Symmetry: D2
Subunit: 129 residues, 4 copies
């Protein structure tokens, strides 16, 4: 079910996306929890050349703070869309940079659940053998 | 040239990259100034699928703070490499998302100089739609 | 167990990667089958800003021939690596542009098997517009 | 001017894009000349994670054929849009993978002109340099 740390991430990313002007360029926020308990937030940057999803912005934000390993991450869409699953590219970046991470997604009953990244990319390509 | 604002960007970005462990994944920092005078920082996230350069992380960090227009931006590499010119992808995202921005690059003498983004993408493709 | 049309894909992509110079930039070949019976090939283009995987080159090659809907796709690595699973970015693009497609991956016994793209991106992010 | 070589690359790219159904996903074609006397074509694959531009599909298609060095490249938009300049990400990939290449862009009078790739990325970021 819904733990406190999980709930806090959802709350943090929701507040971030709700606080900013409605935009088609900046339309999703993410929040991640680090091993040491810090939370890092970000929003996406839309671009046809592969502007970062919100989760990638969060990864650079976390790395800028020397956060180390991230344990959980969630993305929240604008306009009351709620939890969005990480896109395939996010999943690959997460698997390669934070193999221990979980992402919050909606389960088969619509309920938020924290899932190991490996389960979100079955038979995953692993970069560098 | 070298007006206090830009000198400060170089300082902030240099401080950011020197404060984190040496890494091949997180190896460049960026700092941008917003129109209202705030500074935003970030580091890159290396990935073969196009992990964001440090400047793209900065864009998403500024956007998360509702910073609006960014007016200047610099990237500083780790291991005392100093100023790095924005890559071509960065130039395109900057042109499209912050067309009034300047990027700090090195001139012929290897001295910091702030250049209009359009001068870094001569005959630039301008994204419509 | 697979079919024999999917077997043809493996053979074609194997022949492709073994017919070019060994390269760190161009290291994977792909082949896809169109509903109209044609086979399209491609090799990856490595770049830190997100050079396309071999599958994405295949998509553009198929599109350039007005192929329509692709039904199956496989990647074969150089250094005699055999089948590589689509990376998470490939999976997202495939889900979004050819939602009916299957990808050939290695099963537990190390043998080629065709899997629906949706199975490779569970709880998938649904790109709209 | 309009050299026979320029004119042919433009015609090849134009024919390619004009030959496929009008599409928001596949909307630009590219053609490149190789030093070994071949021409390679491709169309873009639009995706928010950074689906390749037409030029990158061309690079993977050239690589698939063991083309080696490409000497000139052009992109042509659908719906009679004519020549499109390479986007900044294309300029970066081209500078890094084919530093000798020229791109066809429009000049001040709207006429086709071939320019060295380095002219399109002044003060260029030099990958692993
Ligand atoms: C023409 N456009 C593009 C408009 C597009 N409809 C914007 C768009 O589709 N953005 C989406 C792209 C990235 C993104 N995304 C997706 C999944 C995820 N887990 N994290 C993300 O940050 O979510 C955004 C979202 O759903 O609004 C612009 N001028 N920006
Ligand atoms: C094998 N690798 C990749 C190692 C690569 N050498 C890392 C690399 O080349 N990173 C580079 C990619 C992005 C980047 N970059 C470049 C220009 C710019 N204006 N901003 C940036 O953020 O700067 C980085 C840099 O110069 O170290 C990993 N395991 N990470
Ligand atoms: C130093 N480098 C980078 C060398 C890198 N090791 C090359 C590299 O890892 N390329 C990888 C990137 C893309 C890619 N790829 C991956 C999965 C997949 N399904 N299809 C692909 O085309 O597979 C390649 C592969 O496994 O050699 C260069 N200058 N190229
Ligand atoms: C498929 N789409 C996106 C619709 C977009 N308007 C399509 C779009 O803008 N595509 C553009 C993206 C890439 C691209 N491009 C650009 C420059 C260049 N030198 N080569 C290219 O291949 O050219 C395309 C073009 O001008 O139609 C959605 N479902 N949102
Ligand atoms: C690691 As958790 C309890 O925030 O999904
Ligand atoms: C702060 As400035 C003059 O480098 O755009
Ligand atoms: C022929 As098949 C099952 O690999 O799409
Ligand atoms: C074929 As050309 C003249 O644009 O290098
Ligand atoms: Zn993503
Ligand atoms: Zn960049
Ligand atoms: Zn891929
Ligand atoms: Zn491009």
């Amino acid at each position: 079910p819904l733990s406190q740390e999980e709930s806090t991430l959802i709350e943090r990313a929701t507040a971030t996306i709700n606080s900013i002007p409605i935009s088609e360029d900046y339309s999703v926020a993410s929040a991640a929890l680090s091993s040491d308990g810090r939370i890092f937030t970000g929003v996406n940057v839309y671009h046809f050349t592969g502007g970062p999803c919100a989760q990638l912005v969060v990864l650079g934000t976390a790395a800028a703070a020397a956060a180390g390993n991230l344990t959980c991450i969630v993305a929240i869409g604008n306009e009351n869309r709620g939890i969005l699953s990480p896109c395939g590219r996010c999943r690959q970046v997460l698997l390669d940079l934070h193999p221990g991470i979980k992402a919050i997604v909606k389960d088969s009953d619509g309920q938020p659940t924290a899932v190991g990244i490996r389960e979100l990319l079955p038979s995953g390509y692993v970069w560098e053998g």
